[PDB]
Structure formats: structure tokens, C-alpha cells
Amino acid sequence: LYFQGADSCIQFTRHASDVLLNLNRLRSRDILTDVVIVVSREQFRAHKTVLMACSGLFYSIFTDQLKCNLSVINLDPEINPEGFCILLDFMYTSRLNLREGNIMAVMATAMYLQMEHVVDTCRKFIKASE
Ligand SMILES: O=C1Cc2cc(Nc3nc(NCc4cccnc4)ncc3Cl)ccc2N1
Numbered sequence: 771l772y773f774q775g776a777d778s779c780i781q782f783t784r785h786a787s788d789v790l791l792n793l794n795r796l797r798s799r800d801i802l803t804d805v806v807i808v809v810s811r812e813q814f815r816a817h818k819t820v821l822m823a824c825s826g827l828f829y830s831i832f833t834d835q836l837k838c839n840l841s842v843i844n845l846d847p848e849i850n851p852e853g854f855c856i857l858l859d860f861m862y863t864s865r866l867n868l869r870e871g872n873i874m875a876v877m878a879t880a881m882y883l884q885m886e887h888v889v890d891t892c893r894k895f896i897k898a899s900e
């Protein structure tokens with residue numbers, strides 16, 4: 771479906787989420803993935819443009835003339851791979867699987883990746899939990 775947006779244009783309600791769903795399908799089938807992110811010896815395949823669109827750290831890395839060519843990126847080995855996995859899934863779905871057992875790891879990983887809206891959200895859920 772579509773609607774008449776704030777401008778004159780026709781706007782498609784599900785378009786952006788459909789694009790993201792299709793990018794996640796590509797990721798799931800390893801189609802056009804162009805980088806491996808390595809965390810504590812676990813490898814995660816992804817699309818650089820999606821990483822950059824969601825993360826300040828990945829934005830800085832891939833706009834750098836030297837680093838934009840890298841097909842492998844190592845993160846700080848103190849990073850929890852589960853924390854990374856949760857944020858990567860978020861990037862491709864808009865859904866953040868936050869819970870008691872993981873929220874601290876997720877918040878620390880989001881801070882490192884410069885995902886400021888996720889960091890704020892984590893703060894609110896920790897602050898309410900106290
Ligand atoms: O009108 C349109 C818009 C459109 C987008 C895409 N792109 C993708 N589709 C899927 N899966 C569904 C699919 C697979 C194979 C054939 N048909 C549909 N996964 C990933 C991507 Cl990137 C494919 C076809 C069409 N047709």
C-alpha cells in the first residue's frame with residue numbers, strides 16, 4: 771500500500787522495510803557480501819553499506835581512503851560476539867533483542883560501534899530496571 775505523503779509524492783509504506791528485508795535475505799544467502807567482521811575469532815559476513823548506514827565506527831572506517839578496501843575488519847577482542855550478533859541483526863531488521871542477560875554486553879558493543887540511538891535505548895531500559 772501507499773499514501774499521499776507530506777509532500778505531493780506518493781509514498782510506499784512498506785518500501786524501506788521491504789528493502790531491508792531483501793538486504794537481510796541477501797546476507798542470509800551470502801550474496802554480494804563484501805566484508806567479514808571478526809569478533810573473538812568468530813566471523814560475520816555483511817554488506818559495508820548497511821554497516822555504514824547504521825554505525826558511526828563503520829562509517830569512519832569505510833570512508834577512509836586506506837581502510838575502505840579492506841575485506842576483513844577485526845574488532846576489539848574484548849567485544850562479545852553475541853552482543854555484535856544482536857546489533858548486526860538489528861541493523862538488518864529494525865528489531866533489537868534486548869534482555870536482562872545481554873543488555874550490558876549489547877550497550878557496550880553499541881557504544882564501541884557508535885550506535886547512539888541504541889545506546890540511549892539501553893540506558894532507558896537499565897534506568898527503569900533500577
Ligand atoms: O517486483 C519485484 C521487486 C523484487 C525484488 C527482488 N529482490 C530480492 N528478492 C528476494 N526474494 C524474493 C524473490 C526471489 C526471487 C524471485 N522473486 C522474488 N530476496 C532478495 C532480493 Cl534482493 C526480487 C524480485 C523482485 N520483484
Ligand SMILES: [K+]
Pocket residue numbers: 810847848849850851
Ligand atoms: K570476548
